[model samples]
Target: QSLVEMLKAMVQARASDIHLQAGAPPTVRIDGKLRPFGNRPLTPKEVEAIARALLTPEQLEELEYRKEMDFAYTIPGVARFRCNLLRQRGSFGLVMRVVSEVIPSFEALGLPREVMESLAAKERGLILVTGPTGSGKSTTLAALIDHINLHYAKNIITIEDPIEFLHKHKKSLVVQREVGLDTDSFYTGLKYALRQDPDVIMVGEMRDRETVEAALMAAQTGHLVLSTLHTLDAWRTINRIIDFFPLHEHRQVRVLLAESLLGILSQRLLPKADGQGRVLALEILIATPYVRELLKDEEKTPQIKEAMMEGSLYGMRTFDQHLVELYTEGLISLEDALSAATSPHEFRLLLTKA
Candidate 1:
């Protein structure tokens, strides 16, 4: 099939992802699961042809020299794709993630009202949206940023690896940067962003100690910093950052995090009951006064999980609660819930109590 033809097929089938690999049939991911389209494997020449067919002459030359490329493409009014072309087993392959033009509302996606409301009301603080790979973290971040962009008049500086979502200037002015194309690296772009006079800073991923520290500094300096990490639950997310620093410096890092960190949104996209698509199941940790105090003292770190369970006023909830809610609503299977939960025993206990 032609590139556009295969792409249209993927979109019509509601596939979340399209994969073109040498020596393999074209594959599409639906409902968080990947399925091959044809019975036969593809040849290297075929994969290269398909990938090259989607690129312009300039882009083709760039890909040939660089051996890897990450960028976005749109089919005019049809659909947008976050495209990644890379070398695999000495041959070229492509992975395209479909991006919808219309941004879905938080409510429509089944996200809690509290998540949107809290973000909407925030003037300055860090909100970390975190999840494992392929968990729709970027999509969630884009939605939150778009919400603020539509409603608030501010300057938003975003540093992304490939710049996934395309946002137009509305109530806010948005400056989007890609890591390699626009700048040398995330760290370099972030250093320059400090002088951009930004009201909000969006870091694509807090990948290292330096990046994490820089983000915290940006947050402390009064910009509403939003970023992501790859952890399972809120407490672990906190610990991951703290532990990233030297053990001797952890006390100070804890204090910094306590004062600046606003919320941690840990989410996953689980397959729906009908298997049409996946929806987000989230564990939100909104920092309260007590939670802040705990972070100020390293001794208080261990108590975060318990505080999350008890702090109903802050709308904080554990992953166990989130999974149980999904299970009760028939949104996910019990086995899937248990497997995804941070603590299986705790999830079971929540179920028993319910």
Candidate 2:
């Protein structure tokens, strides 16, 4: 079958990701599980052909030079994909993550209205939505931006590796820049984005110290900077940012982070109880005065989780709290909740209470 045909099948099946590799039947990930498309295994030449067919001459050269390349692919009227081409076992392999044509609202995604609305209302501070791969981080960020675009009047500039969700001008002017295509890198895009007269800046992912510093600076200078990280929870997210700097600079960086930080929303997608789809389980950390003070001292960072538990009135919640709620509401099964919980032991105790 052609690549477009395969992608159409993937979308029809509601798959999140598609994998093309030698000796595999072109697998697709559904509900966090990888399943083969068919019984027929693929050959190396077939995989290479698929890769060459999807990529351009320039993209093929990039893949050959760097042994990996990331680019966006669209099938005319179908949908867009975030394509990653790489070499595995001396054979070309491709993994394409499906990006929807229509961005879903926060309510549709099952996000907390109060929390997301509060996050969207923030004027100037650093807000982070973090999760592991394929955990719906991008979707959440897009919803947040869409909320701002519909309600607020501002300039929103997004620096992404390969732009996923396309935003049009609404009440806000949204401009998206792709890495290696629109500019050099995230750091460079963010450095120039400051001069673009932007009120809201979105860094697709803060992969390095330079980009993190630039994002922090943008937030410090009165821009509501939104970004994503691969970290699992709030305290770990804070440590990941601080650990990006040197030992002597840790204190200064922590102070900067504490002062300009807005909040962190760490999320995971768990299978629903009825086996239809996934539900979002989140741990929200609002950088309240107490939380900011705790972040100033490295030794006191661990207590931030406790602060989130106590600050429920501020729309803050720990993963365990959310997990228990999901379980009690029958949105997720106990097994799935335990698997996604930060503290499985505590989660079980809460389930007992429920």
Candidate 3:
């Protein structure tokens, strides 16, 4: 059988990812655990043949040139896979992550719907979803975008690197463009999207300063911009946005972020108490007047956590607080909560204080 058959079987078991190497049997990650499948081992020849089958001539050229390449392909009526091919030990290795076509709903994912819908309702500002790689960042972004699409009649343009989730027109005229297929780059895609009279824009990622600059500018100039960054929590997310610029210019960028920033949703997935599935905990930061002012200063950024601690009335929370919240609700055990806590010691102290 081919690599394609292996992936089909992997998805049948609800596996999230598959890893293939020349000297080993295929492995699939199920529920955050990886174990080799029952498939037989492969040699370099077999692995290389799979790579050739997966990539087109140009894709193969890019993979050979860079020694590593990423691309997405769909198996019609089955699933979509985002793959990374690497040259290791002078042989081809491939890793694939399954991306389902079904856009997850907020309720099914246990996202705070009131806060999310409120963020979705904002007319023009930047809303960011932050997390590490392999977190639910992309899924969250797609869910929120669909929320706006269902409720508004405005034109929404989404510029994605490989276009992860497929969206059809709802109440809003949803337009999606891939970075290379539809446009040259994120900057060019955004520039073209901005000129086309769009009310909302989604950039797949804020990968660099230039894309950040374009997104921030579009956000302030009366377009709602939603994007993702790889950062841990809300305060760090704010700092990452400023740190996109050089030292002296961070102050200037903070003001742009302060005025145009609406909400920051940071997420983490931890093992549930029963170990059946994972649970989501969040750190949500909403920009009130005081929080906005704090964003401009170099030192007061960390104090934004103080605002979130007291601003629970506004649905704000720190990651630590959410840990406590989840623990109290009995969704997770003490050990798992402490393990996932940003600070385990303080988590216990907060547990006692609560």
Candidate 4:
């Protein structure tokens, strides 16, 4: 069945990550917690056989040399999942994350529709969706592209290390390129992408200076570029980019960033108060003229968070603002909100006032 029956069962149970480990029972993460499914643990014989079933001879050979791997697997007509093959002790352990078959809408994703629509249809700028690993960043990115894919007639290119969600050509043409299979890395893929006549480009993640520099230049040259980083909030996202350069390049890098940066959507995931599921807390920062000045001034970049909190007219928000809203709505517990807040003491005061 190609692990067929097992996946379908979990897919219905709200499972996101499934773990297969030799010498342990199969476990599935429901609402972000690992709960063992069956009582019986798999022996090495059974576990190894399952892993081998997913790989071809070439992949097996590569696994032997690399000792670990990252790739995508599908359940045929149902769903596709990203796999991280790991060497545990003396056996193989695999972690798989499910990719949604349908690209969700902004409202469906708890995103601000108006703000995202404005950001998506920009003529030229850099937009970022950043969060921790498995923070549902991919889903939001997918939706943003799909919006452009359906509403605008243009060419889009995406460079992902392991291509997850498959996009068909809608009103706009989309070509997804994998890091290893389609090209060497984000830098090289983006280097020649400028020549491919694309209106928008999506790089998988900003990992290095070369890649960031390439993306900044691409944005500077009037191409709409969207990518992800691991930053937790808008302020960190701004300063982190500046931290990528030395003192000599700080002024130029800051200028380039402030001029071309469109917005930063920093997302976070926390379990609901009732443990039913998780909720998304987004910190949105739309670049205004005042925001640009802060990004350019080394002494004032910390005020970017303030800009987001105060720019409600421009549809901006900070994570704490959203967290407080979730608390007010009883979507998240007070403890979770405070712990996750950027300033716990400040949050406590706010809660008391409420």
Best by TM-score: 4
How big is the positional error of residue 285 in model 4, measured in Å on the Cα after superposition? 0.9
Q: Considering lDDT, which of the candidate structures 1 and 4 is the better prediction for this target?
A: 4
Candidate lDDT scores, in order, read 0.83, 0.89, 0.86, 0.87
348: Cα error in model 3, Å: 1.6
Give the per-residue lDDT of model 1 (tens digit) for 271-352.
7766667768888788788889877877777788888888767788787887888899898888788888887888888999
Model 2 lDDT, residue 99, Cα = 73
Candidate 2 lDDT over 148-187, as tens digits, reads 9999999999998767688888899999998889999989
Rate residue 3 of model 2 by lDDT: 69
Query: Across residues 1-354, which tens digit of lDDT does each residue of candidate 3 receive?
Result: 456676788889888888888889988888778989976887889888888898888887776578788888777777888888888898889888787767889997779899999998988999999999767888899999899989989899999877767788889988888887789888888889988999999998887799999999999998999999999988778878887899988778988989999999898888887777888889989988889988977678788978998888778988889999899988899988988888898789889977
Q: Rank the candidates by TM-score, best first.
A: 4, 1, 2, 3
Q: 1 or 4: which has the higher TM-score?
A: 4
TM-score, one value per model: 0.91, 0.88, 0.87, 0.92
User: Which clashing pairs does model 2 show?
Assistant: none
Model 2 stretches astray by more than 4 angstroms: 1-3, 44-72, 82-93, 297-300
Where in model 3 is the C-alpha error above 4 Å? 1-5, 48-72, 82-87, 297-300
Which residue segments of model 1 deviate by more than 4 Å?
Answer: 58-73, 82-92
Clashing pairs in 3: none
User: Backbone collision count in every prediction?
Assistant: 0, 0, 0, 0
Model 2: which ten-residue window has the lowest total lDDT? 59-68
